Amino acid sequence: ATFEIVNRCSYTVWAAASKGDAALDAGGRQLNSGESWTINVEPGTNGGKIWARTDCYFDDSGSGICKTGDCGGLLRCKRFGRPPTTLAEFSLNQYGKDYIDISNIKGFNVPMDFSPTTRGCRGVRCAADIVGQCPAKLKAPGGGCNDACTVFQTSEYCCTTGKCGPTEYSRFFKRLCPDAFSYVLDKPTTVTCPGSSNYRVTFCPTA
């Protein structure tokens, strides 16, 4: 499957793509404002994620740091990124269908649209100004709006036992972005697409 990753933000981002134990395609790349990078993701990929990283520095070997979304200091991510990270999440070719969502469970750094470029389903978007509106206790000094699990490390926020409810913090993310997951047991906002759809992830889709 192809995923065109487009940076419509006014700032550079370093796109990242991983399934947690491996890179997807090259795993990461710089995208200056306006650039587009198309990756290929193997059919059947389960638990894939794409995200933006901000304010990164890499040396000539691809090693460095980002303030949001760092994946073990690599340009080419093999592993998921450090919160806060708005997440485009997908599982492809799962019993004949693809499944996509956006999640704020690991916080928010950059606004996002995640849409099919092929027939048969709708996109999802979280493009509100969550960083600007972030509750004071969730603001990341490093940049972005942390989720409450990251900040407070409680069973309730992290849904450790599987029985957690919404919270004042999850409700903030849900108010700003109804169409993204705000906590682990949120009412799902997953979209079912035809198996082997192709997609576009756009950072800063609006404004």
PDB file of C-alpha atoms in Angstrom:
ATOM      1  CA  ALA A   1       0.000   0.000   0.000  1.00  0.00           C
ATOM      2  CA  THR A   2       1.110   3.520  -0.669  1.00  0.00           C
ATOM      3  CA  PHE A   3       0.948   6.276   1.909  1.00  0.00           C
ATOM      4  CA  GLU A   4       1.744   9.774   0.640  1.00  0.00           C
ATOM      5  CA  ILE A   5       2.880  11.813   3.643  1.00  0.00           C
ATOM      6  CA  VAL A   6       2.442  15.528   3.075  1.00  0.00           C
ATOM      7  CA  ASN A   7       3.693  18.312   5.313  1.00  0.00           C
ATOM      8  CA  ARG A   8       1.384  21.327   4.947  1.00  0.00           C
ATOM      9  CA  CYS A   9       2.765  22.833   8.155  1.00  0.00           C
ATOM     10  CA  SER A  10       4.796  26.013   7.971  1.00  0.00           C
ATOM     11  CA  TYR A  11       7.593  24.246   9.843  1.00  0.00           C
ATOM     12  CA  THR A  12       9.697  21.259   8.960  1.00  0.00           C
ATOM     13  CA  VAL A  13       8.662  17.894  10.334  1.00  0.00           C
ATOM     14  CA  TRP A  14      10.473  14.534  10.289  1.00  0.00           C
ATOM     15  CA  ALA A  15       7.898  11.959   9.319  1.00  0.00           C
ATOM     16  CA  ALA A  16       8.156   8.534  10.944  1.00  0.00           C
ATOM     17  CA  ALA A  17       6.594   5.190  10.092  1.00  0.00           C
ATOM     18  CA  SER A  18       6.904   2.020  12.197  1.00  0.00           C
ATOM     19  CA  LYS A  19       5.024  -1.056  13.362  1.00  0.00           C
ATOM     20  CA  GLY A  20       6.804  -0.984  16.735  1.00  0.00           C
ATOM     21  CA  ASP A  21       9.386  -3.689  16.099  1.00  0.00           C
ATOM     22  CA  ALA A  22      10.410  -2.584  12.617  1.00  0.00           C
ATOM     23  CA  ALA A  23      10.460   0.416  10.270  1.00  0.00           C
ATOM     24  CA  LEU A  24       7.883   0.800   7.612  1.00  0.00           C
ATOM     25  CA  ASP A  25       9.734   1.674   4.396  1.00  0.00           C
ATOM     26  CA  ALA A  26      12.769   3.715   5.369  1.00  0.00           C
ATOM     27  CA  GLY A  27      11.101   4.518   8.691  1.00  0.00           C
ATOM     28  CA  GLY A  28      11.621   8.272   8.600  1.00  0.00           C
ATOM     29  CA  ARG A  29      12.498  11.266   6.462  1.00  0.00           C
ATOM     30  CA  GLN A  30      12.662  15.055   6.658  1.00  0.00           C
ATOM     31  CA  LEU A  31       9.727  16.891   5.053  1.00  0.00           C
ATOM     32  CA  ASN A  32      10.177  20.628   4.703  1.00  0.00           C
ATOM     33  CA  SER A  33       7.036  22.744   4.502  1.00  0.00           C
ATOM     34  CA  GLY A  34       5.080  21.624   1.462  1.00  0.00           C
ATOM     35  CA  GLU A  35       7.024  18.451   0.720  1.00  0.00           C
ATOM     36  CA  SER A  36       5.491  15.071   0.056  1.00  0.00           C
ATOM     37  CA  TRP A  37       7.095  11.677   0.714  1.00  0.00           C
ATOM     38  CA  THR A  38       5.456   8.483  -0.543  1.00  0.00           C
ATOM     39  CA  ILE A  39       6.113   5.260   1.334  1.00  0.00           C
ATOM     40  CA  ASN A  40       5.228   1.678   0.643  1.00  0.00           C
ATOM     41  CA  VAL A  41       3.787  -0.368   3.473  1.00  0.00           C
ATOM     42  CA  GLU A  42       3.613  -4.159   3.119  1.00  0.00           C
ATOM     43  CA  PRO A  43       0.144  -5.656   2.881  1.00  0.00           C
ATOM     44  CA  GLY A  44      -0.932  -7.250   6.126  1.00  0.00           C
ATOM     45  CA  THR A  45       0.885  -4.738   8.297  1.00  0.00           C
ATOM     46  CA  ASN A  46      -0.782  -4.850  11.697  1.00  0.00           C
ATOM     47  CA  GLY A  47      -0.401  -2.068  14.170  1.00  0.00           C
ATOM     48  CA  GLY A  48       1.362   0.426  11.926  1.00  0.00           C
ATOM     49  CA  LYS A  49       1.735   4.057  12.882  1.00  0.00           C
ATOM     50  CA  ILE A  50       2.803   7.276  11.141  1.00  0.00           C
ATOM     51  CA  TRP A  51       3.592  10.431  13.052  1.00  0.00           C
ATOM     52  CA  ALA A  52       5.439  13.708  12.811  1.00  0.00           C
ATOM     53  CA  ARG A  53       8.514  14.643  14.785  1.00  0.00           C
ATOM     54  CA  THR A  54       9.469  18.228  15.495  1.00  0.00           C
ATOM     55  CA  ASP A  55      12.592  20.222  16.155  1.00  0.00           C
ATOM     56  CA  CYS A  56      15.050  17.388  15.206  1.00  0.00           C
ATOM     57  CA  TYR A  57      18.855  17.381  14.776  1.00  0.00           C
ATOM     58  CA  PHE A  58      20.535  14.467  13.008  1.00  0.00           C
ATOM     59  CA  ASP A  59      24.206  13.923  12.217  1.00  0.00           C
ATOM     60  CA  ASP A  60      25.492  12.455   8.934  1.00  0.00           C
ATOM     61  CA  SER A  61      24.842   8.934  10.164  1.00  0.00           C
ATOM     62  CA  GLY A  62      21.186   9.561  10.944  1.00  0.00           C
ATOM     63  CA  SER A  63      21.562   9.811  14.708  1.00  0.00           C
ATOM     64  CA  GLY A  64      20.340  12.654  16.841  1.00  0.00           C
ATOM     65  CA  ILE A  65      17.317  13.864  18.728  1.00  0.00           C
ATOM     66  CA  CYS A  66      13.832  15.310  18.251  1.00  0.00           C
ATOM     67  CA  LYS A  67      11.737  17.196  20.780  1.00  0.00           C
ATOM     68  CA  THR A  68       8.609  15.393  19.954  1.00  0.00           C
ATOM     69  CA  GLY A  69       8.269  11.891  18.626  1.00  0.00           C
ATOM     70  CA  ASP A  70      11.898  10.816  18.904  1.00  0.00           C
ATOM     71  CA  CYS A  71      12.389   7.152  18.104  1.00  0.00           C
ATOM     72  CA  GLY A  72      15.558   6.232  19.921  1.00  0.00           C
ATOM     73  CA  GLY A  73      17.478   9.067  18.331  1.00  0.00           C
ATOM     74  CA  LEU A  74      17.215   7.710  14.783  1.00  0.00           C
ATOM     75  CA  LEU A  75      16.216   9.525  11.612  1.00  0.00           C
ATOM     76  CA  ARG A  76      15.057   6.144  10.291  1.00  0.00           C
ATOM     77  CA  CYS A  77      12.632   4.941  12.910  1.00  0.00           C
ATOM     78  CA  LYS A  78      12.448   1.309  13.833  1.00  0.00           C
ATOM     79  CA  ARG A  79      10.435   1.864  16.997  1.00  0.00           C
ATOM     80  CA  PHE A  80       7.545   4.021  18.121  1.00  0.00           C
ATOM     81  CA  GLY A  81       8.145   7.623  19.073  1.00  0.00           C
ATOM     82  CA  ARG A  82       8.361   9.431  22.336  1.00  0.00           C
ATOM     83  CA  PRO A  83       5.140  11.209  23.366  1.00  0.00           C
ATOM     84  CA  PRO A  84       3.607  13.597  22.675  1.00  0.00           C
ATOM     85  CA  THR A  85       2.759  12.286  19.233  1.00  0.00           C
ATOM     86  CA  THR A  86      -0.475  12.587  17.252  1.00  0.00           C
ATOM     87  CA  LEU A  87      -0.829   9.108  15.708  1.00  0.00           C
ATOM     88  CA  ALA A  88      -2.128   7.899  12.359  1.00  0.00           C
ATOM     89  CA  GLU A  89      -2.790   4.196  13.089  1.00  0.00           C
ATOM     90  CA  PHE A  90      -3.607   1.391  10.712  1.00  0.00           C
ATOM     91  CA  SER A  91      -3.890  -2.335  10.251  1.00  0.00           C
ATOM     92  CA  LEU A  92      -4.055  -3.500   6.653  1.00  0.00           C
ATOM     93  CA  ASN A  93      -5.542  -6.622   5.102  1.00  0.00           C
ATOM     94  CA  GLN A  94      -7.145  -7.857   8.268  1.00  0.00           C
ATOM     95  CA  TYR A  95      -9.641 -10.466   7.088  1.00  0.00           C
ATOM     96  CA  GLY A  96     -10.161  -8.572   3.859  1.00  0.00           C
ATOM     97  CA  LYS A  97     -10.409  -5.003   5.191  1.00  0.00           C
ATOM     98  CA  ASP A  98      -8.195  -2.169   6.341  1.00  0.00           C
ATOM     99  CA  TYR A  99      -8.710  -0.259   9.581  1.00  0.00           C
ATOM    100  CA  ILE A 100      -7.572   3.305  10.198  1.00  0.00           C
ATOM    101  CA  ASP A 101      -7.815   5.815  13.030  1.00  0.00           C
ATOM    102  CA  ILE A 102      -6.194   8.839  14.620  1.00  0.00           C
ATOM    103  CA  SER A 103      -5.226   8.623  18.277  1.00  0.00           C
ATOM    104  CA  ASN A 104      -4.372  11.170  20.955  1.00  0.00           C
ATOM    105  CA  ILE A 105      -3.723   8.402  23.536  1.00  0.00           C
ATOM    106  CA  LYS A 106       0.002   9.241  23.296  1.00  0.00           C
ATOM    107  CA  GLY A 107      -0.669  12.970  23.242  1.00  0.00           C
ATOM    108  CA  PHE A 108      -0.675  15.486  20.423  1.00  0.00           C
ATOM    109  CA  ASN A 109       2.148  17.341  18.714  1.00  0.00           C
ATOM    110  CA  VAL A 110       1.056  18.171  15.124  1.00  0.00           C
ATOM    111  CA  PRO A 111      -2.427  18.297  13.591  1.00  0.00           C
ATOM    112  CA  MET A 112      -3.318  15.570  11.150  1.00  0.00           C
ATOM    113  CA  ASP A 113      -5.599  14.337   8.447  1.00  0.00           C
ATOM    114  CA  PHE A 114      -5.514  10.608   7.574  1.00  0.00           C
ATOM    115  CA  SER A 115      -7.572   9.818   4.511  1.00  0.00           C
ATOM    116  CA  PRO A 116      -7.855   7.138   1.835  1.00  0.00           C
ATOM    117  CA  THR A 117      -6.776   8.110  -1.674  1.00  0.00           C
ATOM    118  CA  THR A 118      -8.859   5.224  -3.061  1.00  0.00           C
ATOM    119  CA  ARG A 119     -12.552   4.348  -2.910  1.00  0.00           C
ATOM    120  CA  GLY A 120     -14.869   3.119  -0.272  1.00  0.00           C
ATOM    121  CA  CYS A 121     -14.422   4.891   3.082  1.00  0.00           C
ATOM    122  CA  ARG A 122     -13.974   8.295   4.727  1.00  0.00           C
ATOM    123  CA  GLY A 123     -10.906   9.916   6.290  1.00  0.00           C
ATOM    124  CA  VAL A 124     -10.418  11.022   9.865  1.00  0.00           C
ATOM    125  CA  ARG A 125      -8.896  14.276  11.134  1.00  0.00           C
ATOM    126  CA  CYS A 126      -7.630  15.886  14.280  1.00  0.00           C
ATOM    127  CA  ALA A 127      -6.680  19.407  13.259  1.00  0.00           C
ATOM    128  CA  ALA A 128      -7.720  21.616  16.190  1.00  0.00           C
ATOM    129  CA  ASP A 129      -5.156  23.651  18.080  1.00  0.00           C
ATOM    130  CA  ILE A 130      -4.611  21.136  20.867  1.00  0.00           C
ATOM    131  CA  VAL A 131      -1.151  22.474  21.674  1.00  0.00           C
ATOM    132  CA  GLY A 132      -2.421  26.029  22.059  1.00  0.00           C
ATOM    133  CA  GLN A 133      -5.401  24.963  24.149  1.00  0.00           C
ATOM    134  CA  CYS A 134      -3.561  22.254  26.154  1.00  0.00           C
ATOM    135  CA  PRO A 135      -4.365  22.080  29.876  1.00  0.00           C
ATOM    136  CA  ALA A 136      -1.468  23.513  31.860  1.00  0.00           C
ATOM    137  CA  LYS A 137      -0.643  20.229  33.599  1.00  0.00           C
ATOM    138  CA  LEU A 138      -0.394  18.396  30.261  1.00  0.00           C
ATOM    139  CA  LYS A 139       1.805  20.897  28.448  1.00  0.00           C
ATOM    140  CA  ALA A 140       5.092  19.281  27.462  1.00  0.00           C
ATOM    141  CA  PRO A 141       8.036  21.606  28.228  1.00  0.00           C
ATOM    142  CA  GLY A 142       9.721  19.974  25.325  1.00  0.00           C
ATOM    143  CA  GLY A 143       6.827  20.905  23.064  1.00  0.00           C
ATOM    144  CA  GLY A 144       3.258  19.444  22.480  1.00  0.00           C
ATOM    145  CA  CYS A 145       0.373  18.331  24.710  1.00  0.00           C
ATOM    146  CA  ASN A 146       1.005  15.159  26.670  1.00  0.00           C
ATOM    147  CA  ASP A 147      -1.597  12.563  27.398  1.00  0.00           C
ATOM    148  CA  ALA A 148      -2.438  12.025  31.063  1.00  0.00           C
ATOM    149  CA  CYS A 149      -0.929   8.539  31.206  1.00  0.00           C
ATOM    150  CA  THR A 150       2.467   9.948  30.206  1.00  0.00           C
ATOM    151  CA  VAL A 151       2.204  12.683  32.823  1.00  0.00           C
ATOM    152  CA  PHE A 152       0.693  10.881  35.828  1.00  0.00           C
ATOM    153  CA  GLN A 153       1.295   7.153  35.340  1.00  0.00           C
ATOM    154  CA  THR A 154      -1.938   5.965  36.945  1.00  0.00           C
ATOM    155  CA  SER A 155      -3.942   2.838  36.216  1.00  0.00           C
ATOM    156  CA  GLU A 156      -6.917   5.053  35.429  1.00  0.00           C
ATOM    157  CA  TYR A 157      -5.162   7.125  32.763  1.00  0.00           C
ATOM    158  CA  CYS A 158      -3.069   4.281  31.365  1.00  0.00           C
ATOM    159  CA  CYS A 159      -6.020   1.790  31.449  1.00  0.00           C
ATOM    160  CA  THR A 160      -3.674  -0.742  32.828  1.00  0.00           C
ATOM    161  CA  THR A 161      -6.306  -3.123  34.029  1.00  0.00           C
ATOM    162  CA  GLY A 162      -8.633  -2.675  31.079  1.00  0.00           C
ATOM    163  CA  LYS A 163     -11.502  -0.961  33.004  1.00  0.00           C
ATOM    164  CA  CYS A 164     -10.835   2.784  32.942  1.00  0.00           C
ATOM    165  CA  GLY A 165     -13.299   5.550  32.199  1.00  0.00           C
ATOM    166  CA  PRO A 166     -13.057   8.919  30.512  1.00  0.00           C
ATOM    167  CA  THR A 167     -11.327  11.619  32.510  1.00  0.00           C
ATOM    168  CA  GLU A 168     -11.169  15.389  32.605  1.00  0.00           C
ATOM    169  CA  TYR A 169      -7.967  15.117  30.562  1.00  0.00           C
ATOM    170  CA  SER A 170      -9.323  12.642  27.987  1.00  0.00           C
ATOM    171  CA  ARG A 171     -12.394  14.813  27.644  1.00  0.00           C
ATOM    172  CA  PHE A 172     -10.190  17.773  26.578  1.00  0.00           C
ATOM    173  CA  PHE A 173      -8.703  15.780  23.704  1.00  0.00           C
ATOM    174  CA  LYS A 174     -12.163  14.458  22.777  1.00  0.00           C
ATOM    175  CA  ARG A 175     -13.719  17.941  22.806  1.00  0.00           C
ATOM    176  CA  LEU A 176     -11.006  19.328  20.536  1.00  0.00           C
ATOM    177  CA  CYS A 177     -10.921  16.199  18.332  1.00  0.00           C
ATOM    178  CA  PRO A 178     -14.077  14.080  18.472  1.00  0.00           C
ATOM    179  CA  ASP A 179     -12.833  11.839  15.675  1.00  0.00           C
ATOM    180  CA  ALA A 180      -9.673  10.658  17.468  1.00  0.00           C
ATOM    181  CA  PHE A 181      -9.180   8.236  20.296  1.00  0.00           C
ATOM    182  CA  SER A 182      -8.846  10.150  23.579  1.00  0.00           C
ATOM    183  CA  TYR A 183      -8.188   7.245  25.963  1.00  0.00           C
ATOM    184  CA  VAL A 184      -7.730   3.487  25.600  1.00  0.00           C
ATOM    185  CA  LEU A 185     -11.412   2.545  26.036  1.00  0.00           C
ATOM    186  CA  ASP A 186     -12.870   5.422  24.075  1.00  0.00           C
ATOM    187  CA  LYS A 187     -15.832   4.682  21.864  1.00  0.00           C
ATOM    188  CA  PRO A 188     -13.955   3.698  18.689  1.00  0.00           C
ATOM    189  CA  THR A 189     -13.481   6.114  15.824  1.00  0.00           C
ATOM    190  CA  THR A 190     -11.882   3.486  13.607  1.00  0.00           C
ATOM    191  CA  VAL A 191     -12.872   3.541   9.964  1.00  0.00           C
ATOM    192  CA  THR A 192     -13.188   0.374   7.905  1.00  0.00           C
ATOM    193  CA  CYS A 193     -11.717   0.712   4.418  1.00  0.00           C
ATOM    194  CA  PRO A 194     -11.504  -1.831   1.573  1.00  0.00           C
ATOM    195  CA  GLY A 195      -8.541  -4.128   1.936  1.00  0.00           C
ATOM    196  CA  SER A 196      -5.492  -2.769   0.121  1.00  0.00           C
ATOM    197  CA  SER A 197      -6.619   0.841   0.091  1.00  0.00           C
ATOM    198  CA  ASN A 198      -4.011   3.567  -0.323  1.00  0.00           C
ATOM    199  CA  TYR A 199      -3.761   6.673   1.868  1.00  0.00           C
ATOM    200  CA  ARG A 200      -2.565  10.199   2.453  1.00  0.00           C
ATOM    201  CA  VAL A 201      -1.380  11.540   5.819  1.00  0.00           C
ATOM    202  CA  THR A 202      -1.372  15.339   5.821  1.00  0.00           C
ATOM    203  CA  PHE A 203       0.253  17.276   8.634  1.00  0.00           C
ATOM    204  CA  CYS A 204      -1.406  20.644   9.282  1.00  0.00           C
ATOM    205  CA  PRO A 205      -4.311  20.012   6.932  1.00  0.00           C
ATOM    206  CA  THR A 206      -6.066  23.284   7.737  1.00  0.00           C
ATOM    207  CA  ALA A 207      -5.266  26.903   8.464  1.00  0.00           C
TER     208      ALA A 207
END
